[PDB]
Amino acid sequence: TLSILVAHDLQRVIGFENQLPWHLPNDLKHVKKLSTGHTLVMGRKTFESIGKPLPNRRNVVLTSDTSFNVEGVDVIHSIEDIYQLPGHVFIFGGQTLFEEMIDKVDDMYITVIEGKFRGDTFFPPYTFEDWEVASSVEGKLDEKNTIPHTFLHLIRKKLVPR
Ligand SMILES: NC(=O)c1ccc[n+]([C@@H]2O[C@H](COP(=O)([O-])OP(=O)(O)OC[C@H]3O[C@@H](n4cnc5c(N)ncnc54)[C@H](OP(=O)(O)O)[C@@H]3O)[C@@H](O)[C@H]2O)c1
Ligand SMILES: COc1cc(Cc2cnc(N)nc2N)cc(/C=C/C(=O)N2N=Cc3ccccc3[C@@H]2c2ccc(C)cc2)c1OC
């Protein structure tokens, strides 16, 4: 399986100055539970922002840098390399990788952050006409998670004769 994994706000902002614009622990827990035991594919900037590999999953970084080498990280240099990765692969970010892959993935795990943040990087536009809502689950709010958010699992609709 090839999936997108992303959090975007009401205007599809995903980032600001190489950071997440929001503080939302529950979304990072969501990410953890979905991706443990599987594979994350991320662009170089997204990796440098996180700074280290995330434990208990395969960490794959796409970069043109032939000198790139980080302990605990596998490196690829082409989009085509993604299709040779075994198992359930999650496209993890950032904007560049989402743009390159949104037309190629089977499904998307999207956290909709129900707010409007300042951003400098965006998830590409998409329409629910093309995507079936396999599930939509409201995140629970509390002391440490104060921004309303919704977990969407979207599956690409098949084109059929009407
Ligand atoms: N909200 C979310 O869910 C989420 C998730 C992830 C990231 N983010 C945010 O997204 C932002 C970063 O996105 P970004 O687009 O600026 O950077 P990015 O996609 O994280 O990484 C860009 C880099 O990926 C490498 N790359 C991409 N496509 C390639 C290809 N076809 N071949 C070879 N290398 C390729 C290049 O690395 P080299 O330049 O080294 O060649 C490129 O400069 C950050 O603000 C981050 O916080 C948000
Ligand atoms: C640009 O910065 C980032 C971008 C993304 C991508 C992303 C985020 N959200 C959604 N919905 N999709 C995505 N593709 C993740 C992160 C976060 C990574 C990150 O520390 N943990 N994660 C998974 C994980 C697994 C095992 C141990 C620890 C972690 C860690 C983490 C987990 C839970 C809490 C409460 C706190 C921290 C990130 O750094 C802030």
Curated annotation (Swiss-Prot):
Q: What is this protein called?
A: Dihydrofolate reductase
Protein family per UniProt: Belongs to the dihydrofolate reductase family.
Coiled coil region boundaries? none
Recorded catalytic reaction(s): these are: (6S)-5,6,7,8-tetrahydrofolate + NADP(+) = 7,8-dihydrofolate + NADPH + H(+)
- Source species, please? Staphylococcus aureus
Q: Which GO terms describe its molecular function?
A: dihydrofolate reductase activity; NADP binding
- Positions of substrate binding: L5, V6, D27, S49, R57, F92
Describe its function: Key enzyme in folate metabolism. Catalyzes an essential reaction for de novo glycine and purine synthesis, and for DNA precursor synthesis.
| Source lineage | Bacteria, Bacillati, Bacillota, Bacilli, Bacillales
Q: Pathway, per Swiss-Prot/TrEMBL?
A: Cofactor biosynthesis; tetrahydrofolate biosynthesis; 5,6,7,8-tetrahydrofolate from 7,8-dihydrofolate: step 1/1
Q: Which residues form the DHFR domain?
A: 1-156
Keywords of the record: NADP, One-carbon metabolism, Oxidoreductase
Q: Does the keyword Nucleus apply?
A: no
EC class name = oxidoreductase
Other comment: There are two DhfR isozymes in S.aureus, this one is chromosomal and is sensitive to trimethoprim.
Binding-site residues, NADP(+): 6-7, 14-19, 43-46, 62-65, 92-97, 100, 121
Q: Name one GO biological process term.
A: dihydrofolate metabolic process
> EC number(s) for this protein?
1.5.1.3
Domain of life from the UniProt record: Bacteria
Enumerate the CDD domains for this protein. Answer: DHFR
Tell me which GO cellular component terms the UniProt record holds: cytosol
